Amino acid sequence: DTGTEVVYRRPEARDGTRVWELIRDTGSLDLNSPYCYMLLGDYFNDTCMIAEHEGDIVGFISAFRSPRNPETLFVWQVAVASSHRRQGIAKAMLTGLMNQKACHGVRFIETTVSPSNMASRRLFLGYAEEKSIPSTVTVGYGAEMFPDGTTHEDEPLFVIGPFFNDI
Amino acid sequence: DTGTEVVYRRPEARDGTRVWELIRDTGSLDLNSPYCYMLLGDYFNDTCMIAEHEGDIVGFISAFRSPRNPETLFVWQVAVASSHRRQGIAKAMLTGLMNQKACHGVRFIETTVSPSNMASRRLFLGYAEEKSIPSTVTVGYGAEMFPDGTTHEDEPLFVIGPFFNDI
Ligand SMILES: CC(=O)NCC[C@H](N)C(=O)O
Numbered sequence: 301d302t303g304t305e306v307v308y309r310r311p312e313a314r315d316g317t318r319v320w321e322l323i324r325d326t327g328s329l330d331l332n333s334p335y336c337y338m339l340l341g342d343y344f345n346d347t348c349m350i351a352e353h354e355g356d357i358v359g360f361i362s363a364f365r366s367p368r369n370p371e372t373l374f375v376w377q378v379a380v381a382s383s384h385r386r387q388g389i390a391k392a393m394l395t396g397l398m399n400q401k402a403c404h405g406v407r408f409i410e411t412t413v414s415p416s417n418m419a420s421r422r423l424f425l426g427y428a429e430e431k432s433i434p435s436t437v438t439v440g441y442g443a444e445m446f447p448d449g450t451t452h453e454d455e456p457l458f459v460i461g462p463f464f465n466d467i
Numbered sequence: 468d469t470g471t472e473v474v475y476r477r478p479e480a481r482d483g484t485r486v487w488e489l490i491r492d493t494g495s496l497d498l499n500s501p502y503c504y505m506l507l508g509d510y511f512n513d514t515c516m517i518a519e520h521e522g523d524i525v526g527f528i529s530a531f532r533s534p535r536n537p538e539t540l541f542v543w544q545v546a547v548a549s550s551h552r553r554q555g556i557a558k559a560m561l562t563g564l565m566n567q568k569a570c571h572g573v574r575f576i577e578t579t580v581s582p583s584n585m586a587s588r589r590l591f592l593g594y595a596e597e598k599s600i601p602s603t604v605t606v607g608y609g610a611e612m613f614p615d616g617t618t619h620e621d622e623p624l625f626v627i628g629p630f631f632n633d634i
């Protein structure tokens with residue numbers, strides 16, 4: 301009611317660079333090219349979300365419906381600017397995302413959560429808990445799959461479901 | 468017939484790093500994270516292809532079916548190792564890709580070709596020519612959409628079709 305609440309929308313291609321800058325300043329996230337973020341704004345925007353505060357992007361979530369089993373939504377990246385941690389933005393993006401019309405008929409959410417990303421661990425398990433949906437945590441990608449120089453963590457798989465996301 | 472022909476297959480998640488290294492050595496391509504290439508091997512592998520020669524990855528093409536209009540296949544990256552230019556690998560990946568069962572019922576191919584990427588300009592317009600399919604070249608992403616520091620070219624849109632890709 302005073303122009304300082306966080307607002308949520310689908311991205312567009314022209315957001316790509318501002319999304320890229322958010323992911324870049326996070327430091328801790330796996331940065332894709334600016335082009336990749338434009339394509340997500342262009343072709344995957346039905347299953348992605350941006351959070352903004354006072355003209356700045358402060359949050360992003362990317363996801364897609366799995367091409368082979370489109371009842372599975374894969375959540376790719378969740379980012380929240382440093383300056384806006386601990387305000388429920390991640391939970392609000394995820395919740396908003398699942399209420400999008402393009403998530404109709406999703407029965408499982410899959411994602412990968414780095415050991416160090418404790419906020420996401422809480423977001424996904426918390427989501428499932430709150431809606432009383434089963435959750436399963438298993439081996440995802442191991443550290444050793446990543447390039448020799450790099451020093452990447454494991455990416456354990458989190459599966460939420462089965463449930464039925466009705467529109 | 469002598470173990471030195473180039474071979475073509477769908478990638479898998481565990482190819483992600485070797486794909487990333489190919490894209491990285493290309494220099495000229497927009498490098499995504501290793502994770503992105505793993506996800507393409509994992510979830511989009513039905514519409515992607517790897518080319519190998521003597522145990523080394525020498526080619527990659529990534530593509531996906533557009534979520535909003537799945538009769539459109541978007542071709543994201545086409546890469547051919549420096550050491551294997553001018554051998555028809557790109558044309559063979561593209562041709563192989565379009566013969567995959569997951570490309571059934573595609574009616575349009577969309578992609579973006581950098582002004583400097585003259586091999587891709589030839590690949591896509593050549594493909595359309597050879598199959599007698601219409602092609603259309605229009606404004607895609609402008610240079611100015613890209614991040615301030617970076618020095619990226621335009622990404623003009625190439626649309627091939629309508630046609631009917633029958634299995
Ligand atoms: C759910 C989440 O936080 N997924 C993404 C992890 C991945 N390593 C990335 O940020 O690309």
Ligand SMILES: CC(=O)NCC[C@H](N)C(=O)O
Binds near residue numbers: 496542544578584622
């Ligand atoms: C068709 C092609 O060569 N597309 C990709 C261009 C893009 N800038 C990239 O390589 O990510």
